[PDB]
């Protein structure tokens, strides 16, 4: 099921930093900060990594909301289709996570895509996980809203392969 990028790219330090460069107007700023914090929390529990929010361009994981072509040669596409993308660990753009703000970001059952759930998937990519072929798993490449615990055995096995 689980996959890794073709060098098995991974962080080589334990104290990962992240910077929320900008915000969507879809949700209050404090709701967005907490959504991202909760998504890191899923991953910190199961690895030796910690995640510390910083306010610097030197952060490992830089998080941005953007539309269409937005500075990395991999353009977004308006509403629906692509929701977000992230790059495997390494310097600069690597490890960064981008969210399509042409999408409607929400939490809970209803309109839009759960920022928490999408961020959890994207942060998986930013730690080194590729897509899983196990349909029950967070890294399986289909968004489904759920209230249940996001991590699957396959996700934890994968992240253990990289940091365990
Ligand atoms: C299918 C793939 C070509 O496209 N994705 C880009 C990507 O890989 N982002 O990581 S996506 O934006 O549509 C997408 C699809 C599913 C999810 C996802 C899956 C499970 C839970 C939450 C989100 C996130 C983005
Ligand atoms: Ca980075
Ligand atoms: Ca889109
Ligand atoms: Ca939006
Ligand atoms: Zn991008
Ligand atoms: Zn993905």
Measure CA of the first residue to CA of the last residue in the chain; give whole Å: 18
Strand boundaries in 40-81, DSSP class E:
50-53, 61-66
Ligand 1 atom with least separation from CA of 131: 8
Contacts of 99 (CB under 8 A, 6+ apart): 24, 63, 64, 65, 66, 83, 84, 105, 115, 118, 119, 122
Give residue 103 CA to ligand 5 midpoint distance, Å: 14
Q: Do 23 and 31 touch, CB atoms closer than 8 A? A: no
Alpha carbons 54 and 22: distance in angstroms, whole number: 13
- Domain with 152, as residue range(s), is 1-164
* Residues annotated catalytic, as ranges: 122
Domains held by the chain: number: 1
Buried b (16+ CB within 10 A) or exposed e, 51-76: beeeeeeebbbbbbbbeeeeeeeeeb
CATH number at 86 reads: 3.40.390.10
Method by which this entry was solved? X-ray
Resolution (A): 1.8
Q: Which of these, 129, 122, 76, lies nearest to 100 by C-alpha position?
A: 76
Give residue 111 CA to ligand 2 midpoint distance, Å: 31
Contacts of 10 (CB under 8 A, 6+ apart): 89, 127, 128, 162, 163
> To 10 degrees, the CA torsion angle through 102, 26, 73, 143?
-80
């Amino acid at each position: 099921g689980f996959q890794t990028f073709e060098g098995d790219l991974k962080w080589h330090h334990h104290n990962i930093t992240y910077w929320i460069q900008n915000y969507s107007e879809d949700l209050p700023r404090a709701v967005i900060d907490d959504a991202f914090a909760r998504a890191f929390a899923l991953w910190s529990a199961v690895t030796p990594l910690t995640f510390t929010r910083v306010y610097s361009r030197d952060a490992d994981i830089v998080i941005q909301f953007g539309v269409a072509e937005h500075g990395d040669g991999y353009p977004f596409d308006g509403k629906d289709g692509l929701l977000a993308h992230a790059f495997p660990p390494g310097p600069g753009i690597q490890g960064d996570a981008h969210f399509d703000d042409d999408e409607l970001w929400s939490l809970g059952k209803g309109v839009g895509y759960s920022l928490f759930l999408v961020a959890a998937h994207e942060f998986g990519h930013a730690l080194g996980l590729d897509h899983s072929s196990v349909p029950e798993a967070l890294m399986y490449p289909m968004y489904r809203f759920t209230e249940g615990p996001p991590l699957h055995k396959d996700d934890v096995n994968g992240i253990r392969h990289l940091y365990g």
